[PDB]
Design an enzyme around this catalytic site. Structure first.
Site, short mmCIF file in Angstrom:
data_model
loop_
_atom_site.label_atom_id
_atom_site.label_comp_id
_atom_site.label_asym_id
_atom_site.label_seq_id
_atom_site.Cartn_x
_atom_site.Cartn_y
_atom_site.Cartn_z
N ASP A 54 27.83 44.86 46.65
CA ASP A 54 28.71 44.48 47.75
C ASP A 54 27.80 43.99 48.87
O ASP A 54 26.78 44.61 49.17
CB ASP A 54 29.53 45.68 48.22
CG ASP A 54 30.43 46.23 47.13
OD1 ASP A 54 31.06 45.42 46.42
OD2 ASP A 54 30.51 47.47 46.99
N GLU A 63 33.06 49.83 56.28
CA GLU A 63 32.49 49.21 55.08
C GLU A 63 30.98 49.00 55.25
O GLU A 63 30.19 49.33 54.35
CB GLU A 63 33.13 47.84 54.82
CG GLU A 63 34.55 47.86 54.25
CD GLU A 63 34.61 48.35 52.81
OE1 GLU A 63 33.54 48.42 52.17
OE2 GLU A 63 35.72 48.66 52.33
N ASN A 102 32.26 41.80 47.13
CA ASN A 102 31.71 42.06 45.80
C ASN A 102 31.24 40.86 44.96
O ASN A 102 31.90 39.82 44.91
CB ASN A 102 32.74 42.90 45.02
CG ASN A 102 32.24 43.32 43.66
OD1 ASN A 102 32.36 42.58 42.68
ND2 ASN A 102 31.65 44.51 43.58
N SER A 104 27.57 45.34 39.81
CA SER A 104 27.82 44.41 40.90
C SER A 104 27.29 45.00 42.21
O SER A 104 27.00 46.20 42.29
CB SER A 104 29.31 44.10 41.03
OG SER A 104 30.04 45.23 41.47
N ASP A 137 29.17 49.27 37.96
CA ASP A 137 29.42 48.18 37.03
C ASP A 137 28.34 47.10 37.09
O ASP A 137 28.41 46.10 36.38
CB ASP A 137 30.82 47.58 37.28
CG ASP A 137 30.95 46.88 38.62
OD1 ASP A 137 30.07 47.05 39.49
OD2 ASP A 137 31.95 46.15 38.80
N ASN A 175 27.02 48.91 42.83
CA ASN A 175 28.08 49.67 42.18
C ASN A 175 27.67 49.95 40.73
O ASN A 175 26.75 49.32 40.20
CB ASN A 175 29.38 48.85 42.23
CG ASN A 175 29.79 48.51 43.65
OD1 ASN A 175 30.10 47.35 43.96
ND2 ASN A 175 29.80 49.50 44.52
#
Lengths: 70, 58
Positions: free
Chosen positions: A52, A35, A59, A50, A48, A46
């Site tokens: 991470d 990750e 998120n 958002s 959308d 991301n």
């Protein structure tokens, strides 16, 4: 900070992640590895809107506030 | 935007993983377990994960 494999494992075990919810420590170290590559400063945006964050890429849509996620 | 872990995202970038660990504990208890982490599900799930702690002094 970029953790060492065994170093993070020790840190996570100490914080009670080993066998937490039935997930052995190796799962968490593996997750952190792919990750964030063990880097606590890792960030990724991301589509959308958002982002991470951290070693486990948590998120901003539902877990933490970054002041720019709808 | 929900802040279920009740913390600024910047707090998850600290060299001290306490914040991330506590929030991850909330996430994994949510319902889909660790499947909530795309990389875990695609690169860890169903593999010999014990290998990641091998050789370590736990």
């Amino acid at each position: 900070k970029v953790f060492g494999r065994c170093e993070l494992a020790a840190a996570m075990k100490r914080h009670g992640l080993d066998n937490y919810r039935g997930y052995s420590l190796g799962n968490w170290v593996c997750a952190a590895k792919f990750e964030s590559n063990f880097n606590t400063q890792a960030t990724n945006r991301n589509t959308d809107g958002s982002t991470d964050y951290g070693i486990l890429q948590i998120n901003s849509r539902w877990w933490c506030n970054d002041g720019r996620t709808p | 935007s929900r802040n279920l872990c009740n913390i600024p995202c910047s707090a998850l970038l600290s060299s001290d993983i306490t914040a991330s660990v506590n929030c991850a504990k909330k996430i994994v208890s949510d319902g889909n377990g660790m499947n909530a982490w795309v990389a875990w599900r695609n690169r860890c799930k169903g593999t010999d994960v014990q290998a990641w702690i091998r050789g370590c002094r736990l």
